[PDB]
Amino acid sequence: AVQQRRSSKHRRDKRRSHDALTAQALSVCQKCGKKKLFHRVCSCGMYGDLRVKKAY
Amino acid sequence: MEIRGIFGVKVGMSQVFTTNNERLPITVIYCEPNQVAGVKTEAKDKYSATLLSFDTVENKKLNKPQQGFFEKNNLKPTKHLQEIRNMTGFEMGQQITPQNLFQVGEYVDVSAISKGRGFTGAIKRWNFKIGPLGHGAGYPHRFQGSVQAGRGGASAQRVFKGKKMSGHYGHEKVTVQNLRIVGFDEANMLVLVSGAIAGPEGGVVLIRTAKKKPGVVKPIELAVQTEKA
């Protein structure tokens, strides 16, 4: 393991171009009508009607 | 030599005693009569073979193109298909009765996909040696170490091409020959075959006439345990 110079600038960005974070495909909520995300809980808390998450 | 073929799934490993003071592990392969997808006579196809479909699934679990070709060819929706080569004597909608097309004693070959192993060491699939297991010096016991190609001014000052390094090990469709035939069960359309088949128990098993021999029938070695009280 050894290197004899420093890295470039564009290739450095290309290496960091593969470091993109994960994406999130949102989903609509029929339980309450607010924003939500797929396979997760809603904002109000209702799930299969079963309201389970408290806002406060 | 029109090499007949048959598909199935290996659904068991057993051991059946035979003659000549020996026992032979006899596996079982289960399948159902398949439906031919088509035939190829070599004039522009560049080879002669027969595409056969199998693993029939229900209609709502298949894409429109393939299933549409299936009903247009008088076939049911199937999950898989493959071409058996050097064999074209098919007719349309032929239900596969393998116990008649294959006798009880020929030496046949079997193709199957192996069990996947991912990224493993080099002692498997290449069969090399490892470092010092003991003897009390340092802490190496399994490594490659020497990968020398040249160390100097112009000896090689590079590396060779082609690596005997295991990639995604396992799950490769390979054909092994010299498998004998043992018996048949028409009730379940199952075939008892000498020797286990590669891959997970239940994987694809293709049985065809072998190339090492043109098919030599051997008699059944009578060792059935009819010894009751």
Partner: protein
């Protein structure tokens, strides 16, 4: 290796499983990792099913899986389970508890899930 934190061990895992199953029996809702929820629910439902035979042999058999809490203790937990929790669960052949997947945790971005017991 030199002296250090041993990470996580099977004994620790089973002890944590016992801790959470006793806690959820005490209250009825526990937040955790989904993997741990799947690990715990097997023993949880097996024990609930065992509680429906209603004999002292079951009382002996279930004793190696109960821990105390601030509100209740092992004896109180087992008596409550045998008296009121079990008679409700005679109308379901398994699937006694429910796990609901929440959002990621705010400390390590871990998939969180809340496990509760509802008939």
């Amino acid at each position: 290796s030199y002296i250090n934190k041993p990470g996580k061990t099977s004994a620790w895992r089973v002890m944590t499983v016992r801790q959470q199953v006793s806690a959820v029996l005490a209250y009825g809702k526990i937040e955790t990792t989904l993997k741990k929820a799947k690990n715990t629910q097997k023993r949880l439902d097996k024990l609930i099913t065992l509680a429906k035979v209603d004999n002292f042999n079951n009382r002996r058999q279930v004793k190696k899986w109960l821990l105390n809490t601030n509100l209740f203790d092992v004896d109180q937990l087992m008596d409550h389970l045998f008296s009121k929790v079990a008679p409700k669960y005679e109308k379901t052949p398994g699937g006694y508890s429910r796990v609901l997947k929440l959002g990621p945790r705010r400390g390590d971005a871990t998939e969180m899930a809340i496990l509760q017991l509802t008939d």
